[PDB]
Amino acid sequence: SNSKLKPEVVEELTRKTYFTEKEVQQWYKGFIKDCPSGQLDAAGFQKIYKQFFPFGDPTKFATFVFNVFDENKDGRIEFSEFIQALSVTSRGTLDEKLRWAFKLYDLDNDGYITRNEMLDIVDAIYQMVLPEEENTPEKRVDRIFAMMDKNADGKLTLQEFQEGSKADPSIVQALSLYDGLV
């Protein structure tokens, strides 16, 4: 029950994502089995991550990701938001995944990623989870800004972030997967 989307909603979500109608319905079944209410909350989102990272404290990073999934900022991830975020992150083009990643790093949505916003995310990633030159979130952030901040003003515009990411082979590789594979 409800474990079926209305016809118009299947048509709409299939047209807004890289999934087939059958895939959208399969994801809804899984979403509903795990979230009876159809509303994934911050705490429920925290568990999906705690699963994959029993060793670290994924609370801060899971919260950062939750906020990007929560396109309506109502504090709950509804299926439409869930499937569209899974679509871009798992199957989007490189340019699409970069725009999503920018949204993740630009904490206050002002169009620039400041050094401190990036540090917050990277520190969260380290807390969630090395060679000396990358053993602290501050060193990782300094290298990223050395490589991407072209006008050297301490902030990355979407253009600096996209170009800077495309210049780095490891970043290009990480954002070029489709269902986890090249």
Q: Which residues bind Ca ion (CB under 5 A)?
A: 70, 72, 74, 76, 106, 108, 110, 112, 149, 151, 153, 155
Beta carbons within 10 angstroms of residue 47's beta carbon: 12
Provide, rounded to whole angstroms, the least separation between the CB of residue 80 and Na ion: 36
Name the binding residues.
Answer: 70, 72, 74, 76, 78, 81, 106, 108, 110, 112, 117, 149, 151, 153, 155, 160
Give residue numbers after which the chain breaks (C–N above 2.5 Å): 129
Say which entry of Ca ion, Na ion, none residue 120 contacts (CB below 5 to 8 A, set by partner kind): none
Chain positions 15 to 34 lying near Na ion, rule: CB under 5 A, are none
* Structural contact between residues 158 and 111, judged by C-beta atoms closer than 8 angstroms: yes
CA dist 110 and 118 (Å) reads 14
Say which entry of Na ion, Ca ion, none residue 95 contacts (CB below 5 to 8 A, set by partner kind): none
The SS3 assignment for 95 reads helix
CA dist 172 and 182 (Å) reads 11
Name the binding residues for Ca(2+).
Answer: 70, 72, 74, 76, 78, 81, 106, 108, 110, 112, 117, 149, 151, 153, 155, 160
Nearer to Na ion, 62 or 98 (CB): 98
One character per residue 149-178, x = contact with Na ion (rule: CB under 5 A): ------------------x-----------
The SS3 assignment for 112 reads strand
Residue 6 tokens read as 């209305």
Q: Which of 38, 182, 40, 162 is nearest to 111 (CA)?
A: 162
Which chain residues interact with Na ion by CB under 5 A? 167
